[PDB]
């Protein structure tokens, strides 16, 4: 690798609304099909990332 | 630069590499007590020094007396200790009627280092005057880091693609010192003669209590006092 610049990259952003600062941790599954959030209210919430 | 030890250290490698050198320690075992080669007294198997014997059973370095080993200049061979063991195990008392004219096997073993030994070494260096002390506590971690670099220069960093390869790697990298089974659960006529003997020992100050490790402390103290007094007299 002689000369040139870095590599272009695309990004997709997921945004969560009406959380009021109760969200402590977040994680994605290995195949980008599920998302899990742990909160300050002791419970976990899981969603399918495509709405099915 | 220094040579690093192998992944699994065995008595054969150490005893073959370090032939022709004097052993680190020599211990003589008797029926009820043991001693060292140049020691004058004795240690009973029921005494605190029993701990040392346990190390001899587990082929571990005895860190609990490490200071005493450093004071005496005991040699180390790649962090291990070579110990030679010599084995000699294999009428009418207190009666005025008695008459009187004036009336081994050899083994060699190797003890291997542990993590508690390194912790003890660093802790001792922290309090050993030479800056003031030999090692400043704030520099401890860095020093430790360097030591690790000299003990494990090579690691297994190649990745695996599936669980079968991880299983094979865990099988291949097993260590004898960490391959034991789980421990076991915790578990919980002469009468007339004994009664007569107890009755006949009534109001006895010392013999009654029993129903013995001599340390000669008083004689050593007297000898120290005599030496000090002789030294003081010699000055004048």
């Amino acid at each position: 690798r002689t000369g040139g610049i870095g590599i272009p990259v695309s990004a997709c952003m997921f945004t969560f609304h009406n959380t009021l600062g109760t969200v402590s941790c977040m994680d994605f599954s290995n195949d980008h099909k599920l998302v899990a959030v742990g909160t300050m209210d002791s419970y976990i919430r899981v969603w399918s990332l495509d709405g099915k | 630069t220094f040579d690093a030890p192998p992944y699994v250290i065995t008595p054969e490698y150490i005893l073959k590499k370090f032939a022709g050198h004097p052993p680190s320690l020599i211990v003589h075992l008797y029926q009820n007590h043991f001693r060292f080669d140049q020691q004058e007294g004795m240690f009973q198997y029921k005494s605190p020094m029993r701990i040392f014997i346990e190390h001899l059973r587990n082929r571990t370095v005895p860190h609990e007396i490490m200071e005493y080993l450093i004071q005496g200049g005991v040699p180390f061979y790649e962090g291990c200790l070579i110990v030679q063991v010599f084995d000699h195990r294999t009428t009418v008392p207190f009666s005025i009627h008695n008459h009187n004219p004036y009336i081994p096997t050899v083994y060699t073993v190797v003890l291997m280092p542990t993590a508690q030994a390194l912790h003890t070494d660093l802790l001792l260096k922290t309090v050993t005057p030479r800056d003031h002390m030999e090692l400043d506590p704030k520099n401890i971690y860095e020093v430790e880091a360097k030591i690790l670099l000299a003990t494990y220069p090579k690691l297994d960093l190649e990745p695996t693609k599936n669980a079968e390869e991880t299983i094979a790697k865990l099988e291949k990298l097993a260590h004898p010192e960490h391959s034991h089974k789980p421990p076991e659960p915790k578990v919980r006529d002469e009468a007339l003669a004994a009664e007569q003997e107890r009755y006949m020992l009534t109001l006895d100050e010392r013999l009654s209590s029993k129903l013995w490790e001599p340390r000669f402390e008083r004689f050593k103290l007297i000898e120290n006092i005599k030496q000090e007094h002789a030294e003081k007299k010699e000055q004048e």
């Binding site: - | 050198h21 052993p23 020599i26 140049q38 004058e40 020094m49 005493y68 005991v74 402390e217």
Partner: protein, 62 residues
Amino acid sequence: VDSDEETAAVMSALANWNPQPVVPQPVFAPLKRQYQLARLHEQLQAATNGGRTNIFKVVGFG
């Protein structure tokens, strides 16, 4: 009284705060180990005569 200098000094002083204790914080361990180590030290001090005798010395080559 310059306000910028005062603010810088106050914030720099507050950033490096490090209180000192009045008594040290205790460290806990079982009693059995303490008693055993005390006994071992007594025995070894008696054996070595306070450090005047080297009982671990080896003479010869084994």
